[PDB]
Amino acid sequence: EMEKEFEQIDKSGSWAAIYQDIRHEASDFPCRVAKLPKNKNRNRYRDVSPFDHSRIKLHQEDNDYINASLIKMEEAQRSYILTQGPLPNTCGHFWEMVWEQKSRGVVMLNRVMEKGSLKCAQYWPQKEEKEMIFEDTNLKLTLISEDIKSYYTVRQLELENLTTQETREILHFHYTTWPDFGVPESPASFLNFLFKVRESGSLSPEHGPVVVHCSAGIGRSGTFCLADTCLLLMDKRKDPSSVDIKKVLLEMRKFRMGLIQTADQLRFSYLAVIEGAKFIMG
Numbered sequence: 001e002m003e004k005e006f007e008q009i010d011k012s013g014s015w016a017a018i019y020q021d022i023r024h025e026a027s028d029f030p031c032r033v034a035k036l037p038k039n040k041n042r043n044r045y046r047d048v049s050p051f052d053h054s055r056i057k058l059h060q061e062d063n064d065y066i067n068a069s070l071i072k073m074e075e076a077q078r079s080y081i082l083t084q085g086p087l088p089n090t091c092g093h094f095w096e097m098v099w100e101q102k103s104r105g106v107v108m109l110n111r112v113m114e115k116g117s118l119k120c121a122q123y124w125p126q127k128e129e130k131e132m133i134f135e136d137t138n139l140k141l142t143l144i145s146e147d148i149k150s151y152y153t154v155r156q157l158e159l160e161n162l163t164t165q166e167t168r169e170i171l172h173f174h175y176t177t178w179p180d181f182g183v184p185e186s187p188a189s190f191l192n193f194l195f196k197v198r199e200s201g202s203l204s205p206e207h208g209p210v211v212v213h214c215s216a217g218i219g220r221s222g223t224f225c226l227a228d229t230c231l232l233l234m235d236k237r238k239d240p241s242s243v244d245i246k247k248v249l250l251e252m253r254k255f256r257m258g259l260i261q262t263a264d265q266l267r268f269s270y271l272a273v274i275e276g277a278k279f280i281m282g
């Protein structure tokens, strides 16, 4: 399978090379809207922008920009919205996107503070009695319940459109033990987290695209979506060994830049997929 290739790359210690090999072949499209001066304060990293063709547009006549990309995998029949961790002034935009895109789940793969620094705003209420209201996009957010586990937390939230008093349940999956720029020692916990997301229905067709993010929404977020899509493919195809992870990644990079930030994450993606495969086949 892809495991065969794994050893090959591992025994010859050529990951770094194979990873750079993908960076060179990766797609490159314009990000003009993201670069407008008008949107300077809406971007966390100047080097991490959404392409124009695949960017998510907010549904407002004001400024429709938000650093977020719709990754649409045709064959896998799955779509994901990869975005940056919300900034102090984009939290309203963030929840507007979730509402407008009909998303059921939000997957956060980073902690608010990492390496002693702020990597994202506290964009969701931490206490039931303290609901948040985003005045700029006229939305109300409320913590309904919370389940704290060893390496991840699942929060049930309620998002309400104050314009129409319409309400929806949003599931928040918080992977809290993923070292920044690194990868877990064992993919098991990662995979276990992925399946929890799958079991909630948030990745299903009857719902809008799941919202995935870390700090930049490319490294850890990339690893999450690459593994999910790969497993889904082996699951659907008549040949579970026909799934080319490198092909899947590149196909994803057509929609957002920098997916998979280090050769290590690439190696981890291979592991996560290979291991997750053991389940996909009985």
Ligand SMILES: COC(=O)c1c(O)cccc1OCCCCNC(=O)[C@H](Cc1ccc(OCC(=O)O)c(O)c1)NC(C)=O
Binding pocket: 023, 026, 045, 047, 048, 180, 181, 182, 214, 215, 216, 217, 218, 219, 220, 221, 257, 258, 259, 260, 261, 262
């Ligand atoms: C490796 O670079 C690429 O693949 C790449 C490319 O090929 C083409 C265009 C852009 C690319 O990627 C561009 C990213 C370059 C790396 N730059 C940085 O460290 C940060 C942004 C960043 C990136 C990944 C992160 O974690 C992700 C995680 O692990 O969860 C993160 O927290 C923050 N920028 C600055 C200057 O503060």
